[PDB]
Symmetry: C3
Subunit: 179 residues, 3 copies
Protein backbone atom coordinates (compact mmCIF):
# COMPACT_ATOMS: atom_id res chain seq x y z
CA UNK A 1 0.00 0.00 0.00
CA UNK A 2 2.58 2.57 1.25
CA UNK A 3 5.59 2.03 -1.14
CA UNK A 4 5.69 2.42 -4.96
CA UNK A 5 9.06 1.29 -6.40
CA UNK A 6 11.19 -0.09 -9.18
CA UNK A 7 11.88 -3.67 -8.10
CA UNK A 8 15.47 -4.46 -6.90
CA UNK A 9 15.59 -6.94 -9.86
CA UNK A 10 19.12 -6.62 -11.40
CA UNK A 11 17.53 -6.33 -14.94
CA UNK A 12 17.82 -3.00 -16.81
CA UNK A 13 14.45 -1.14 -16.67
CA UNK A 14 15.00 2.29 -18.28
CA UNK A 15 15.65 4.04 -21.63
CA UNK A 16 17.92 7.12 -21.79
CA UNK A 17 18.59 6.79 -25.58
CA UNK A 18 17.86 3.08 -26.25
CA UNK A 19 15.64 0.42 -24.60
CA UNK A 20 17.25 -1.07 -21.42
CA UNK A 21 20.39 1.12 -21.54
CA UNK A 22 19.92 1.94 -17.81
CA UNK A 23 18.65 0.72 -14.43
CA UNK A 24 16.77 3.26 -12.29
CA UNK A 25 16.21 2.42 -8.60
CA UNK A 26 13.40 4.67 -7.32
CA UNK A 27 11.50 4.08 -4.05
CA UNK A 28 8.51 6.33 -3.13
CA UNK A 29 7.28 5.82 0.48
CA UNK A 30 4.09 7.58 1.63
CA UNK A 31 4.47 9.33 5.04
CA UNK A 32 1.00 11.01 4.92
CA UNK A 33 1.23 14.46 3.31
CA UNK A 34 4.85 13.82 2.11
CA UNK A 35 6.45 11.23 -0.16
CA UNK A 36 9.92 10.14 1.02
CA UNK A 37 11.90 9.37 -2.15
CA UNK A 38 15.16 7.48 -2.67
CA UNK A 39 16.90 7.31 -6.08
CA UNK A 40 20.02 5.85 -7.74
CA UNK A 41 20.90 5.22 -11.41
CA UNK A 42 23.26 2.81 -13.21
CA UNK A 43 23.89 3.10 -16.98
CA UNK A 44 24.45 -0.48 -18.24
CA UNK A 45 25.29 0.12 -21.96
CA UNK A 46 25.51 2.77 -24.70
CA UNK A 47 27.30 6.13 -24.87
CA UNK A 48 26.88 7.08 -21.12
CA UNK A 49 28.00 3.67 -19.67
CA UNK A 50 31.69 4.81 -19.58
CA UNK A 51 32.25 8.60 -19.75
CA UNK A 52 35.43 9.68 -21.60
CA UNK A 53 35.49 13.33 -22.77
CA UNK A 54 39.22 13.07 -23.60
CA UNK A 55 38.48 10.49 -26.35
CA UNK A 56 34.86 11.36 -27.34
CA UNK A 57 34.48 15.05 -28.28
CA UNK A 58 30.76 14.77 -29.23
CA UNK A 59 29.46 13.29 -25.92
CA UNK A 60 26.78 15.34 -24.06
CA UNK A 61 27.09 16.11 -20.33
CA UNK A 62 23.38 15.66 -19.62
CA UNK A 63 20.41 13.33 -20.05
CA UNK A 64 16.84 13.27 -18.73
CA UNK A 65 14.59 10.40 -17.46
CA UNK A 66 10.84 11.19 -17.16
CA UNK A 67 8.10 9.43 -15.17
CA UNK A 68 4.76 10.54 -16.66
CA UNK A 69 1.49 9.75 -14.82
CA UNK A 70 -2.20 9.90 -15.78
CA UNK A 71 -5.02 11.40 -13.62
CA UNK A 72 -5.13 8.07 -11.62
CA UNK A 73 -1.36 8.25 -10.86
CA UNK A 74 -0.66 5.35 -13.31
CA UNK A 75 2.77 5.37 -15.03
CA UNK A 76 2.35 6.09 -18.78
CA UNK A 77 4.04 3.92 -21.49
CA UNK A 78 5.73 7.12 -22.83
CA UNK A 79 7.86 7.25 -19.58
CA UNK A 80 11.63 6.46 -19.83
CA UNK A 81 11.03 3.89 -17.02
CA UNK A 82 9.50 0.56 -18.22
CA UNK A 83 5.98 0.07 -16.63
CA UNK A 84 6.82 -3.67 -16.07
CA UNK A 85 9.31 -2.61 -13.30
CA UNK A 86 6.96 -0.20 -11.41
CA UNK A 87 4.53 -1.42 -8.70
CA UNK A 88 3.71 -1.54 -4.96
CA UNK A 89 6.32 -3.31 -2.72
CA UNK A 90 4.65 -6.31 -0.92
CA UNK A 91 -0.40 -3.32 -12.47
CA UNK A 92 -2.10 -0.93 -9.93
CA UNK A 93 -5.44 1.00 -10.24
CA UNK A 94 -4.82 4.28 -8.25
CA UNK A 95 -1.66 5.96 -6.89
CA UNK A 96 -2.84 9.63 -6.69
CA UNK A 97 -1.57 9.55 -3.05
CA UNK A 98 2.00 9.28 -4.48
CA UNK A 99 1.62 12.11 -7.03
CA UNK A 100 3.33 15.50 -6.68
CA UNK A 101 0.72 17.94 -5.32
CA UNK A 102 -0.62 20.20 -8.17
CA UNK A 103 -1.36 23.16 -5.80
CA UNK A 104 2.26 22.92 -4.50
CA UNK A 105 3.80 22.21 -7.95
CA UNK A 106 1.54 23.79 -10.59
CA UNK A 107 1.85 22.94 -14.33
CA UNK A 108 3.06 25.86 -16.58
CA UNK A 109 0.22 28.09 -18.02
CA UNK A 110 0.37 28.88 -21.83
CA UNK A 111 1.36 32.51 -20.85
CA UNK A 112 3.96 31.23 -18.26
CA UNK A 113 7.69 31.51 -19.29
CA UNK A 114 8.66 28.82 -16.66
CA UNK A 115 7.69 26.89 -13.47
CA UNK A 116 7.98 28.27 -9.89
CA UNK A 117 11.33 27.20 -8.41
CA UNK A 118 9.50 25.23 -5.65
CA UNK A 119 8.72 22.54 -8.33
CA UNK A 120 12.50 21.72 -8.40
CA UNK A 121 14.93 19.93 -6.06
CA UNK A 122 18.67 19.89 -6.69
CA UNK A 123 20.95 17.20 -5.32
CA UNK A 124 24.69 16.67 -5.57
CA UNK A 125 25.34 12.94 -6.26
CA UNK A 126 28.51 11.11 -7.23
CA UNK A 127 29.74 8.47 -9.69
CA UNK A 128 31.60 5.28 -8.73
CA UNK A 129 31.31 6.05 -4.94
CA UNK A 130 33.90 8.90 -5.14
CA UNK A 131 33.33 12.47 -3.92
CA UNK A 132 35.54 13.83 -6.76
CA UNK A 133 33.00 12.56 -9.39
CA UNK A 134 30.13 15.03 -8.86
CA UNK A 135 26.86 14.99 -10.84
CA UNK A 136 23.88 17.34 -10.37
CA UNK A 137 20.46 15.71 -10.21
CA UNK A 138 17.65 18.15 -10.94
CA UNK A 139 14.21 16.77 -9.94
CA UNK A 140 11.24 18.73 -11.33
CA UNK A 141 7.55 18.05 -10.65
CA UNK A 142 4.69 18.53 -13.13
CA UNK A 143 6.83 20.12 -15.93
CA UNK A 144 5.44 17.75 -18.66
CA UNK A 145 2.42 19.55 -20.26
CA UNK A 146 0.76 16.36 -21.71
CA UNK A 147 0.59 14.35 -18.40
CA UNK A 148 -1.58 14.86 -15.28
CA UNK A 149 1.58 14.56 -13.10
CA UNK A 150 5.29 14.07 -13.82
CA UNK A 151 8.64 13.50 -12.13
CA UNK A 152 11.55 14.62 -14.35
CA UNK A 153 15.13 13.53 -13.40
CA UNK A 154 17.72 15.68 -15.25
CA UNK A 155 21.35 14.60 -14.74
CA UNK A 156 24.15 17.02 -15.67
CA UNK A 157 27.87 17.42 -14.92
CA UNK A 158 30.77 19.70 -15.84
CA UNK A 159 33.87 17.48 -15.39
CA UNK A 160 35.74 16.15 -18.45
CA UNK A 161 35.43 12.61 -17.00
CA UNK A 162 38.02 10.08 -18.23
CA UNK A 163 36.80 6.40 -18.16
CA UNK A 164 34.31 6.96 -15.28
CA UNK A 165 31.21 4.70 -15.20
CA UNK A 166 27.78 6.35 -14.81
CA UNK A 167 27.09 4.37 -11.61
CA UNK A 168 25.50 6.86 -9.16
CA UNK A 169 25.36 7.05 -5.37
CA UNK A 170 21.94 7.23 -3.64
CA UNK A 171 19.97 10.43 -2.87
CA UNK A 172 16.96 11.05 -0.64
CA UNK A 173 14.37 13.82 -1.08
CA UNK A 174 10.71 14.42 -0.30
CA UNK A 175 7.78 16.18 -1.91
CA UNK A 176 4.23 17.20 -0.98
CA UNK A 177 1.64 14.51 -1.92
CA UNK A 178 -1.50 15.34 -3.98
CA UNK A 179 -3.71 13.63 -1.32
Amino acid sequence: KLTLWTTLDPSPNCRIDVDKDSKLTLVLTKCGSQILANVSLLVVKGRFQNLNYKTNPNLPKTFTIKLLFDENGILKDSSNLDKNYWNYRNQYKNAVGFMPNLAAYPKSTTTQSKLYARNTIFGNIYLDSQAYNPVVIKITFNQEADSAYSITLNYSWGKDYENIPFDSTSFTFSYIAQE
Copy 2:
Protein backbone atom coordinates in the same frame (compact mmCIF):
# COMPACT_ATOMS: atom_id res chain seq x y z
CA LYS B 1 -3.14 15.61 13.05
CA LEU B 2 0.18 14.43 11.48
CA THR B 3 1.06 17.48 9.26
CA LEU B 4 1.58 21.10 10.42
CA TRP B 5 2.04 23.43 7.43
CA THR B 6 1.76 26.80 5.80
CA THR B 7 -1.23 26.38 3.49
CA LEU B 8 -0.53 26.18 -0.31
CA ASP B 9 -2.71 29.38 -0.53
CA PRO B 10 -0.95 31.66 -3.11
CA SER B 11 -1.13 34.65 -0.65
CA PRO B 12 2.09 36.02 0.89
CA ASN B 13 2.39 34.88 4.54
CA CYS B 14 5.81 36.05 5.79
CA ARG B 15 7.80 39.17 6.78
CA ILE B 16 11.53 39.45 6.01
CA ASP B 17 11.62 43.29 6.28
CA VAL B 18 7.97 44.27 5.61
CA ASP B 19 4.63 42.50 6.23
CA LYS B 20 3.78 39.99 3.44
CA ASP B 21 7.01 40.59 1.46
CA SER B 22 7.46 36.79 1.18
CA LYS B 23 5.73 33.41 0.91
CA LEU B 24 7.22 30.60 3.00
CA THR B 25 6.09 27.05 2.18
CA LEU B 26 6.94 24.86 5.20
CA VAL B 27 5.51 21.36 5.70
CA LEU B 28 6.27 19.43 8.93
CA THR B 29 5.15 15.76 8.78
CA LYS B 30 5.35 13.63 11.94
CA CYS B 31 6.97 10.20 11.39
CA GLY B 32 6.99 9.28 15.14
CA SER B 33 10.25 10.38 16.77
CA GLN B 34 11.27 12.45 13.67
CA ILE B 35 9.70 15.39 11.85
CA LEU B 36 10.18 15.21 8.07
CA ALA B 37 10.39 18.86 6.92
CA ASN B 38 10.06 20.40 3.44
CA VAL B 39 10.74 24.12 2.78
CA SER B 40 10.81 26.65 -0.06
CA LEU B 41 10.69 30.47 -0.11
CA LEU B 42 9.54 33.06 -2.66
CA VAL B 43 10.11 36.80 -2.09
CA VAL B 44 7.12 38.63 -3.64
CA LYS B 45 8.12 42.32 -3.11
CA GLY B 46 10.72 44.65 -1.57
CA ARG B 47 14.52 44.76 -1.78
CA PHE B 48 15.10 40.93 -2.02
CA GLN B 49 12.43 40.27 -4.74
CA ASN B 50 14.99 40.92 -7.55
CA LEU B 51 18.66 40.70 -6.46
CA ASN B 52 21.02 43.09 -8.31
CA TYR B 53 24.35 43.79 -6.56
CA LYS B 54 25.62 45.63 -9.67
CA THR B 55 22.95 48.36 -9.22
CA ASN B 56 22.25 48.23 -5.43
CA PRO B 57 25.46 48.71 -3.38
CA ASN B 58 23.64 48.62 0.00
CA LEU B 59 21.84 45.26 -0.47
CA PRO B 60 22.61 42.54 2.15
CA LYS B 61 23.40 38.94 1.16
CA THR B 62 21.44 37.44 4.06
CA PHE B 63 18.12 37.51 5.87
CA THR B 64 16.59 35.41 8.64
CA ILE B 65 13.02 34.07 9.15
CA LYS B 66 12.20 32.87 12.71
CA LEU B 67 9.37 30.63 13.93
CA LEU B 68 9.13 31.08 17.72
CA PHE B 69 6.94 28.71 19.76
CA ASP B 70 5.57 28.74 23.31
CA GLU B 71 5.57 25.74 25.73
CA ASN B 72 2.42 24.38 23.90
CA GLY B 73 4.14 24.54 20.47
CA ILE B 74 1.96 27.59 19.46
CA LEU B 75 3.55 30.06 16.99
CA LYS B 76 4.28 33.40 18.76
CA ASP B 77 3.21 36.82 17.35
CA SER B 78 6.84 38.06 16.88
CA SER B 79 7.54 35.18 14.39
CA ASN B 80 8.30 36.23 10.79
CA LEU B 81 5.61 33.72 9.64
CA ASP B 82 1.99 34.98 9.96
CA LYS B 83 0.01 32.69 12.39
CA ASN B 84 -3.06 32.92 10.07
CA TYR B 85 -1.21 30.65 7.55
CA TRP B 86 0.00 27.98 10.06
CA ASN B 87 -2.21 24.99 10.98
CA TYR B 88 -2.82 21.23 10.61
CA ARG B 89 -3.48 19.96 7.02
CA ASN B 90 -7.07 18.60 6.60
CA GLN B 91 -6.27 27.78 15.58
CA TYR B 92 -4.51 24.69 17.15
CA LYS B 93 -4.14 24.15 20.95
CA ASN B 94 -1.01 21.85 21.16
CA ALA B 95 1.81 21.03 18.70
CA VAL B 96 4.58 19.90 21.11
CA GLY B 97 4.87 16.71 18.97
CA PHE B 98 6.24 18.92 16.12
CA MET B 99 8.71 20.88 18.29
CA PRO B 100 12.49 20.34 18.06
CA ASN B 101 13.51 18.06 20.95
CA LEU B 102 15.11 20.13 23.80
CA ALA B 103 17.31 17.20 24.99
CA ALA B 104 18.61 16.77 21.38
CA TYR B 105 18.82 20.55 20.66
CA PRO B 106 19.41 22.33 23.98
CA LYS B 107 18.96 26.12 24.41
CA SER B 108 22.18 28.13 25.13
CA THR B 109 23.08 28.40 28.90
CA THR B 110 23.49 31.94 30.46
CA THR B 111 27.34 31.34 30.54
CA GLN B 112 27.27 30.52 26.74
CA SER B 113 25.06 31.93 23.89
CA LYS B 114 26.80 29.39 21.51
CA LEU B 115 24.82 26.19 20.65
CA TYR B 116 26.10 22.65 19.92
CA ALA B 117 26.49 22.17 16.15
CA ARG B 118 23.86 19.35 16.26
CA ASN B 119 21.15 22.11 16.56
CA THR B 120 22.03 23.22 12.97
CA ILE B 121 21.35 21.78 9.49
CA PHE B 122 22.91 23.29 6.37
CA GLY B 123 21.40 22.91 2.93
CA ASN B 124 22.51 24.12 -0.49
CA ILE B 125 19.42 25.47 -2.36
CA TYR B 126 19.14 27.43 -5.62
CA LEU B 127 17.35 30.47 -7.08
CA ASP B 128 15.20 30.43 -10.24
CA SER B 129 15.71 26.63 -10.75
CA GLN B 130 19.40 27.06 -11.82
CA ALA B 131 22.31 25.17 -10.23
CA TYR B 132 24.58 28.22 -10.78
CA ASN B 133 22.43 30.35 -8.37
CA PRO B 134 23.40 28.82 -5.01
CA VAL B 135 22.05 29.95 -1.63
CA VAL B 136 22.92 28.45 1.77
CA ILE B 137 19.99 27.70 4.09
CA LYS B 138 21.03 27.39 7.73
CA ILE B 139 18.30 25.82 9.92
CA THR B 140 18.92 26.16 13.68
CA PHE B 141 16.75 24.77 16.50
CA ASN B 142 16.12 26.43 19.89
CA GLN B 143 18.55 29.39 19.35
CA GLU B 144 15.94 31.94 20.65
CA ALA B 145 16.53 32.40 24.45
CA ASP B 146 13.05 34.02 24.95
CA SER B 147 10.95 31.15 23.39
CA ALA B 148 10.26 27.56 24.59
CA TYR B 149 11.25 26.29 21.08
CA SER B 150 12.36 27.92 17.82
CA ILE B 151 13.15 27.14 14.18
CA THR B 152 15.47 29.76 12.63
CA LEU B 153 15.91 29.84 8.80
CA ASN B 154 19.01 31.89 7.86
CA TYR B 155 19.51 32.41 4.11
CA SER B 156 22.88 33.66 2.84
CA TRP B 157 24.77 33.79 -0.46
CA GLY B 158 28.07 35.01 -1.89
CA LYS B 159 27.34 35.69 -5.59
CA ASP B 160 26.97 39.27 -6.89
CA TYR B 161 23.61 38.27 -8.44
CA GLU B 162 22.42 40.48 -11.32
CA ASN B 163 18.56 40.55 -11.76
CA ILE B 164 17.99 37.13 -10.11
CA PRO B 165 14.64 36.60 -8.32
CA PHE B 166 14.67 35.19 -4.76
CA ASP B 167 12.53 32.22 -5.84
CA SER B 168 14.07 29.17 -4.11
CA THR B 169 14.08 25.47 -4.97
CA SER B 170 12.75 23.00 -2.35
CA PHE B 171 14.76 21.31 0.43
CA THR B 172 14.00 18.39 2.73
CA PHE B 173 15.45 17.77 6.20
CA SER B 174 14.42 16.06 9.42
CA TYR B 175 14.79 16.64 13.15
CA ILE B 176 14.16 14.80 16.41
CA ALA B 177 10.66 15.54 17.84
CA GLN B 178 10.14 16.69 21.48
CA GLU B 179 7.53 13.91 21.99
Copy 3:
Protein backbone atom coordinates in the same frame (compact mmCIF):
# COMPACT_ATOMS: atom_id res chain seq x y z
CA LYS C 1 9.27 0.04 18.33
CA LEU C 2 9.54 2.34 15.25
CA THR C 3 12.75 4.21 16.34
CA LEU C 4 16.22 2.72 17.04
CA TRP C 5 18.62 5.37 18.42
CA THR C 6 21.60 6.38 20.49
CA THR C 7 20.05 7.82 23.63
CA LEU C 8 20.24 11.64 24.10
CA ASP C 9 22.24 10.85 27.31
CA PRO C 10 25.10 13.46 27.36
CA SER C 11 27.70 10.65 27.98
CA PRO C 12 30.26 9.78 25.26
CA ASN C 13 29.23 6.51 23.52
CA CYS C 14 31.70 5.93 20.66
CA ARG C 15 35.34 4.98 19.89
CA ILE C 16 37.19 6.58 16.95
CA ASP C 17 40.69 5.70 18.32
CA VAL C 18 40.04 5.26 22.07
CA ASP C 19 37.01 4.26 24.24
CA LYS C 20 34.52 7.18 24.70
CA ASP C 21 36.50 9.71 22.59
CA SER C 22 33.25 10.63 20.76
CA LYS C 23 29.45 11.00 21.00
CA LEU C 24 27.47 9.75 17.99
CA THR C 25 23.80 10.80 17.75
CA LEU C 26 22.08 8.43 15.29
CA VAL C 27 18.28 8.10 15.00
CA LEU C 28 16.77 5.44 12.67
CA THR C 29 12.97 5.84 12.19
CA LYS C 30 11.08 3.13 10.27
CA CYS C 31 8.69 4.54 7.60
CA GLY C 32 7.75 1.11 6.10
CA SER C 33 10.13 0.20 3.25
CA GLN C 34 12.52 3.10 4.14
CA ILE C 35 14.53 4.05 7.21
CA LEU C 36 14.65 7.82 7.81
CA ALA C 37 18.07 8.45 9.38
CA ASN C 38 19.45 11.48 11.25
CA VAL C 39 23.12 11.72 12.33
CA SER C 40 25.51 14.11 14.09
CA LEU C 41 28.91 13.58 15.75
CA LEU C 42 30.83 15.38 18.52
CA VAL C 43 34.45 14.41 19.34
CA VAL C 44 34.89 14.90 23.13
CA LYS C 45 38.64 14.13 23.57
CA GLY C 46 41.81 12.89 21.82
CA ARG C 47 43.52 14.00 18.59
CA PHE C 48 40.30 14.94 16.63
CA GLN C 49 38.65 17.01 19.45
CA ASN C 50 40.37 20.25 18.28
CA LEU C 51 41.71 20.16 14.69
CA ASN C 52 44.89 22.16 14.10
CA TYR C 53 46.89 21.26 10.97
CA LYS C 54 49.14 24.32 11.47
CA THR C 55 50.50 22.86 14.76
CA ASN C 56 50.06 19.08 14.20
CA PRO C 57 51.68 17.91 10.94
CA ASN C 58 50.89 14.19 11.49
CA LEU C 59 47.08 14.53 11.98
CA PRO C 60 44.88 12.57 9.50
CA LYS C 61 41.96 14.23 7.69
CA THR C 62 39.69 11.19 8.00
CA PHE C 63 38.28 8.64 10.42
CA THR C 64 35.60 5.94 10.17
CA ILE C 65 32.85 4.79 12.62
CA LYS C 66 31.25 1.38 11.89
CA LEU C 67 27.95 -0.10 13.12
CA LEU C 68 28.14 -3.88 12.60
CA PHE C 69 24.96 -6.01 12.97
CA ASP C 70 24.28 -9.75 13.25
CA GLU C 71 21.58 -11.69 11.29
CA ASN C 72 18.95 -10.48 13.89
CA GLY C 73 19.91 -6.79 13.37
CA ILE C 74 21.64 -6.68 16.82
CA LEU C 75 24.61 -4.27 17.16
CA LYS C 76 27.88 -6.26 17.55
CA ASP C 77 30.49 -5.46 20.29
CA SER C 78 33.09 -4.91 17.48
CA SER C 79 31.16 -1.72 16.44
CA ASN C 80 32.71 1.74 17.16
CA LEU C 81 29.36 2.58 18.85
CA ASP C 82 28.98 1.17 22.43
CA LYS C 83 25.97 -1.31 22.55
CA ASN C 84 24.94 0.16 25.97
CA TYR C 85 23.80 3.38 24.18
CA TRP C 86 21.75 1.71 21.36
CA ASN C 87 18.05 0.78 21.84
CA TYR C 88 14.41 1.51 20.91
CA ARG C 89 13.12 5.02 21.90
CA ASN C 90 10.34 4.90 24.58
CA GLN C 91 19.00 -5.21 24.90
CA TYR C 92 16.55 -5.80 21.94
CA LYS C 93 15.83 -9.22 20.25
CA ASN C 94 15.19 -8.33 16.52
CA ALA C 95 15.74 -5.17 14.42
CA VAL C 96 15.99 -6.70 10.87
CA GLY C 97 13.28 -4.13 9.89
CA PHE C 98 15.97 -1.39 10.44
CA MET C 99 18.76 -3.15 8.49
CA PRO C 100 20.00 -1.97 5.07
CA ASN C 101 18.32 -4.18 2.42
CA LEU C 102 20.82 -6.83 1.12
CA ALA C 103 19.15 -6.98 -2.37
CA ALA C 104 19.46 -3.15 -2.61
CA TYR C 105 22.95 -3.03 -0.98
CA PRO C 106 24.73 -6.34 -1.64
CA LYS C 107 27.90 -7.40 0.26
CA SER C 108 31.10 -7.64 -1.90
CA THR C 109 31.50 -11.21 -3.40
CA THR C 110 34.82 -13.19 -3.03
CA THR C 111 35.35 -12.42 -6.82
CA GLN C 112 34.88 -8.61 -6.14
CA SER C 113 35.68 -6.35 -3.08
CA LYS C 114 33.99 -3.42 -4.99
CA LEU C 115 30.39 -2.43 -4.01
CA TYR C 116 27.69 -0.98 -6.33
CA ALA C 117 27.66 2.84 -5.98
CA ARG C 118 24.00 2.65 -4.76
CA ASN C 119 25.37 1.27 -1.39
CA THR C 120 26.82 4.80 -0.74
CA ILE C 121 25.33 8.19 0.25
CA PHE C 122 27.45 11.34 0.35
CA GLY C 123 26.56 14.35 2.49
CA ASN C 124 28.20 17.72 3.00
CA ILE C 125 28.16 18.56 6.75
CA TYR C 126 29.90 21.31 8.70
CA LEU C 127 31.92 21.86 11.89
CA ASP C 128 31.02 24.37 14.62
CA SER C 129 27.81 25.51 12.84
CA GLN C 130 29.77 27.37 10.07
CA ALA C 131 29.34 26.87 6.31
CA TYR C 132 33.09 27.53 5.78
CA ASN C 133 34.01 24.37 7.81
CA PRO C 134 32.96 21.62 5.37
CA VAL C 135 33.30 17.87 6.04
CA VAL C 136 32.23 15.03 3.70
CA ILE C 137 30.26 12.20 5.31
CA LYS C 138 30.32 9.01 3.25
CA ILE C 139 27.69 6.47 4.40
CA THR C 140 28.12 2.95 3.00
CA PHE C 141 25.84 -0.07 3.61
CA ASN C 142 26.95 -3.71 3.98
CA GLN C 143 30.68 -3.05 3.19
CA GLU C 144 31.93 -4.98 6.30
CA ALA C 145 32.64 -8.62 5.22
CA ASP C 146 32.48 -10.09 8.80
CA SER C 147 28.87 -8.90 9.65
CA ALA C 148 25.35 -9.74 8.33
CA TYR C 149 24.68 -5.97 7.87
CA SER C 150 26.70 -2.78 8.41
CA ILE C 151 26.47 1.01 8.35
CA THR C 152 29.90 2.64 7.79
CA LEU C 153 30.30 6.41 8.45
CA ASN C 154 33.52 7.75 6.83
CA TYR C 155 34.31 11.39 7.64
CA SER C 156 36.90 13.26 5.56
CA TRP C 157 37.89 16.88 4.91
CA GLY C 158 40.45 18.88 2.94
CA LYS C 159 40.82 22.16 4.88
CA ASP C 160 43.93 22.81 7.00
CA TYR C 161 41.64 23.60 9.98
CA GLU C 162 43.18 25.81 12.71
CA ASN C 163 41.68 25.24 16.24
CA ILE C 164 38.27 24.02 14.91
CA PRO C 165 36.34 21.53 17.10
CA PHE C 166 35.00 18.34 15.48
CA ASP C 167 31.43 19.24 16.45
CA SER C 168 29.30 18.40 13.37
CA THR C 169 25.98 19.74 12.14
CA SER C 170 23.09 17.29 11.58
CA PHE C 171 22.35 15.34 8.37
CA THR C 172 19.28 13.42 7.21
CA PHE C 173 19.27 10.51 4.75
CA SER C 174 17.21 7.41 4.07
CA TYR C 175 17.84 3.84 2.93
CA ILE C 176 15.82 0.82 1.80
CA ALA C 177 14.88 -1.51 4.73
CA GLN C 178 15.59 -5.29 4.61
CA GLU C 179 11.92 -5.98 5.52
